[PDB]
């Protein structure tokens, strides 16, 4: 048979086969629960909704996210999403072939153990294993070595990899991602005069953000010219015909990402985080790492994020060493390409945690294979 | 050369002086317009009434609340109310004394700008300033730090403060106020048999609510007791002479305030959002905020809400976090007392917003300085 990959992001879930350059299931991970008793008996079944249906209808029901900041909260919702992607989207049994999972760095070994235990108990899969988004994204990009900055929906992080050897005391992660971004966007929009407080409105403003949000180069001058002029602003149409306008929030939210002080979290930005992660290493490898800085994830899908990032890291670093940042247009599925190639190659086969190993030693064995 | 203050709450405006220790002028923020034609002459019948007049006579005209959910919609009506409260209530002049207005968090900067522009161009006030009701109530109570929870007829919200330092990331808002509460009460009365659809009937409903409605501790137990016995039923008198009976609505209304699901609003409860805001603060101030939690506003004047809130929050939060709710016997005017104190203070003088400063820079100074 073949293999299978399924990355469970904080906001979305991307699952498919191996050896392919494009996934099949790309769908959001949200459980829909109606808020009304219902009076009609004809079409009133399917209490809980899963998949794109809960997005086509999101008003009469509340939406709950199973993963927050990369950590799982509701194992019930997680297994519901797994069953949906297995039997409804992929329409293939899990017992036939093994599947690959994903987990961000510094995540609880207890969460990894629960994941593998559920996978081997409920679905009764012959083999299983979990990987990291960073290594998969790097193997997808194909670069030899360097630093990788991956930012999903609710989690962001950067990690270096050189001479085929990871670095535990070099990773640097933060819980500031698209979630807090859309939260601050809702706040500044309430400041503007509109309002978005519910979950469906949260997803609507999330769509607005991922549609018409761009990053700036000089924050102060850009804000000044946006407050003075009114040519950069743009209008957006809501499904009910209502129209809204945005003149400064679009490029203020990226600055919010760059300046956590606005969110109130006393921490460092992504540029300072990368600089610190690099400094903790040895300069002889830092030199070659500066030129190899790959970006992945959806949060980094802004047009021009590479320009601001490279400018800031150059201002913070000496010009004696060449620097460069790369981010191909496929910043979203890169982890899926990495998983696909890793499942296609024959070496990692030996690393597949087999059902025999799990049932004879337990799930805690996963603490060593990481 | 004294000063004054005027809170423009959606429920009713309250204006007074700084040196005083209690407000002098107070009256509903309504505007009545006649709907009929009128035949008799010589009575000096006007075309738009405001203040206690529209309250004394309300069955011959339609009422309008210009401020809804803390947002102004009828600037002409607001100007009329300001003229009435500056000239009729207390015989004074605006050009002779500086004013001090108040607003709620997240209020539109456009609203603030229009407010200050009207106050400057129409009345030619020497100086003015805008603040937040939470810090006002804090200065009134005399404390410095703590978490304020205000709930007026317009909207409700809560915010923490630490040694005068605010935390916008911790601010939380909600649009569950006396308006929707009275609407739900009228709906439940219609379900009971009594009908109330008009504006004068809505005012009678607000009155009977503030007179009878009381919150309970165990909603299910109280509902069972009401459905079983009848000792809880009360009787109210109307201007028509006939009386009406009320059962469980008196506590179902505050329960709707606590459970927005009863009204059909997808959001969190007051205790839930309070705990969420508290959790978004720092661990070294979590405890100081738990004990120094103060409530304000007129809507929170329900009897038995302090014990209910305390029980809910202490059952939701862990132990060794002793709580002490501050719900003094006087809270409807606490914001006015704090405003008077701040105006009488010495340092606050230098923080005024003058007329020449606005004419030079513009109205944007209001949101640029405070």
């Amino acid at each position: 048979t073949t293999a299978l990959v399924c990355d469970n992001g904080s906001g979305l879930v991307k699952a498919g086969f191996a050896g392919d350059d494009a996934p099949r299931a790309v769908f959001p991970s949200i459980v829909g629960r109606p808020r009304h008793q219902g009076v009609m008996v004809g079409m009133g079944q399917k209490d809980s909704y899963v998949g794109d249906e809960a997005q086509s209808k999101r008003g009469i029901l509340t939406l709950k996210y199973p993963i927050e900041h990369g950590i799982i909260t509701n194992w019930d919702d997680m297994e519901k999403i797994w069953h949906h992607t297995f039997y409804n989207e992929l329409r293939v049994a899990p017992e036939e072939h093994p599947t690959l999972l994903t987990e961000a760095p510094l995540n609880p070994k207890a969460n990894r153990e629960k994941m593998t235990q559920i996978m081997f108990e409920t679905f009764n899969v012959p083999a299983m294993y979990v990987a990291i988004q960073a290594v998969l994204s790097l193997y997808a990009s194909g670069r030899t070595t360097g630093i990788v900055l991956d930012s999903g929906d609710g989690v962001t992080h950067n990690v270096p990899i050189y001479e085929g050897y990871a670095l535990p005391h070099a990773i640097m992660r933060l819980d500031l991602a698209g979630r807090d971004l859309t939260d601050y966007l809702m706040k500044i929009l309430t400041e503007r005069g509109y309002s978005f407080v519910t979950t469906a409105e949260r997803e609507i403003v999330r769509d607005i953000k991922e549609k018409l949000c761009y990053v700036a180069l000089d924050f102060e001058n850009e804000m000044a010219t946006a407050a003075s002029s009114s040519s950069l602003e743009k209008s957006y149409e809501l499904p009910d015909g209502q129209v809204i306008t945005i003149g400064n929030e679009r490029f203020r939210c990226p600055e919010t990402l760059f300046q956590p002080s606005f969110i109130g979290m006393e921490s460092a930005g992504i540029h300072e985080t990368t600089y610190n992660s690099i400094m903790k290493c040895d300069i002889d490898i830092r030199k070659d790492l500066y030129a190899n800085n790959v970006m992945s994830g959806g949060t980094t899908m802004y047009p021009g994020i590479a320009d601001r990032m490279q400018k800031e890291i150059t201002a913070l670093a000496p010009s004696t060493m060449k620097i460069k940042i790369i981010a191909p247009p496929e910043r979203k599925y890169s982890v899926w390409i990495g998983g696909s190639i890793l499942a296609s190659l024959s070496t990692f086969q030996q690393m597949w945690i087999t059902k025999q190993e799990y049932d004879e030693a337990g799930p805690s064995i996963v603490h060593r294979k990481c | 050369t004294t000063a004054l203050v005027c809170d423009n709450g959606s429920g009713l405006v309250k204006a007074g002086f700084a040196g005083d220790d209690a407000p002098r002028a107070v009256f509903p923020s309504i505007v009545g317009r006649p709907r009929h034609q009128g035949v008799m002459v010589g009575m000096g019948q006007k075309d738009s009434y405001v203040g206690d007049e529209a309250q004394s006579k309300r069955g011959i005209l339609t009422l309008k609340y210009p401020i809804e959910h803390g947002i102004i919609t009828n600037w002409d009506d607001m100007e009329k109310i300001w003229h009435h409260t500056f000239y009729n209530e207390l015989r004074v002049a605006p050009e002779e004394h500086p004013t001090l207005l108040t607003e709620a968090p997240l209020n539109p900067k456009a609203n603030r700008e229009k407010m200050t522009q009207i106050m400057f161009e129409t009345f030619n006030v020497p100086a003015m300033y805008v603040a937040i009701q939470a810090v006002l109530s804090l200065y009134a109570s005399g404390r410095t730090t703590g978490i304020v929870l205000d709930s007026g007829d317009g909207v409700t919200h809560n915010v923490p403060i630490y040694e005068g330092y605010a935390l916008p990331h911790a601010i939380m808002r909600l649009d569950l106020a006396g308006r929707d509460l009275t609407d739900y009460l009228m709906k439940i009365l219609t379900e009971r048999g009594y009908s109330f659809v008009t504006t004068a009937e809505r005012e009678i409903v607000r009155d009977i609510k503030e007179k009878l409605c009381y919150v309970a501790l165990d909603f299910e137990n109280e509902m069972a007791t009401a459905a079983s016995s009848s000792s809880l039923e009360k009787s109210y008198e109307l201007p028509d002479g006939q009386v009406i009976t009320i059962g469980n609505e008196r506590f179902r209304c505050p329960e709707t305030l606590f459970q927005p699901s009863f009204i059909g609003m997808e959001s969190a409860g007051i205790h839930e959002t309070t705990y969420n805001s508290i959790m978004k603060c720092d661990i070294d101030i979590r405890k100081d905020l738990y004990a120094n939690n103060v409530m304000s506003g007129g809507t929170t004047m329900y009897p038995g809400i302090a014990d209910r809130m305390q029980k809910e929050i202490t059952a939701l939060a862990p132990s060794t976090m002793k709580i002490k709710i501050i719900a003094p016997p006087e809270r409807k005017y606490s914001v006015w007392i704090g405003g008077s104190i701040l105006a009488s203070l010495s340092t606050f003088q230098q923080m005024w917003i003058t007329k020449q400063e606005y004419d030079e820079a513009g109205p944007s100074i209001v949101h640029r300085k405070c």
Binding site: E68, H69, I71, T73, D175 | M279, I283
Partner: peptide, 7 residues
């Protein structure tokens, strides 16, 4: 928030 303590 979902770290059993902080955040």
């Amino acid at each position: 928030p979902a770290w059993l303590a902080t955040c």
